[PDB]
């Protein structure tokens, strides 16, 4: 099936589904977002589609598009946003540094590929 | 408007947030733009990701995405990356956290079901 099996189990808002098949590296490189909810003639109220960037910078024929480490800079920046408002919590203060530290470690893949001269190539 | 990001270096995308602070003091609307431009300066990539604005329950508010399903995408992309050729010790530790930071999000759901709360502009 193309919906992804999340970590949330009851109450979800949206359903994930993978779009295509695999391509470079083993990934999926476009996904859909779509609400549990319809509108009064039964369409979705959201349906939203991710493209990713499918293709390393150097390869030639690759395709623009978002890469995983912007996705989670937004969610970093949405946590930042609740835990200094009204309605911070600490579920939102361990998540949120997962995130960062997780956000790290990809910086830390990306300087790696760049000592080793294989940023943007196809290699390990 | 442009968030300040960990990358500091060779950064593909440019994020910047839309718009004004709305429900629980947060943006609701972002835009990520590539670094790469045409041959006429215009941006390669340019998608738009809104939020949902306003609890599901409460009225007048607008349908959207939320953060768990961006890191669900994520935690699919790195474990189907650690089943390929190009697997990594930095995509282990980064799959480890993003999933970790999932399980967080989910502990934060099931708190507002059990006190009720899941779905209003409450604490
Ligand atoms: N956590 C990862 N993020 C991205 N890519 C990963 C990861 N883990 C393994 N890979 C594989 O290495 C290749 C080049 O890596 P890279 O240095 O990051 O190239 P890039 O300029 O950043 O673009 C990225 C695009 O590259 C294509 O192949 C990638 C992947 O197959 C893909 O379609 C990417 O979407
Ligand atoms: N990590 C958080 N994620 C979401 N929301 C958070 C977080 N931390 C604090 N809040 C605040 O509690 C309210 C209800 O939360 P909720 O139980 O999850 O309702 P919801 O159906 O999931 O929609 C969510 C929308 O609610 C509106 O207010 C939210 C937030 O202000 C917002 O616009 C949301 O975008």
């Not at 509108?39 to 598009?65: C, L, M, P, W």
């Not at 939102?92 to 300087?111: F, G, I, K, P, Q």
Request: with cysteine; net charge neutral; proline share 2%.
């Amino acid at each position: 099936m193309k919906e992804l099996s999340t970590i949330q189990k009851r109450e979800k808002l949206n359903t994930v589904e993978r779009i295509g098949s695999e391509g470079p590296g083993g990934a999926y490189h476009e996904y859909v977002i779509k609400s549990n909810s319809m509108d009064s003639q039964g369409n979705y109220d959201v349906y939203e589609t991710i493209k990713f960037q499918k293709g390393a910078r150097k390869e030639e024929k690759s395709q623009h598009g978002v890469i995983d480490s912007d996705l989670l800079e937004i969610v970093r920046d949405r946590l930042k946003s609740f835990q200094a408002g009204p309605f911070s919590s600490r579920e939102n203060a361990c998540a949120l540094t997962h995130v960062e530290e997780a956000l790290m470690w990809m910086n830390r893949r990306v300087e790696d590929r760049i000592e080793r001269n294989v940023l943007g190539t196809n290699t390990k």
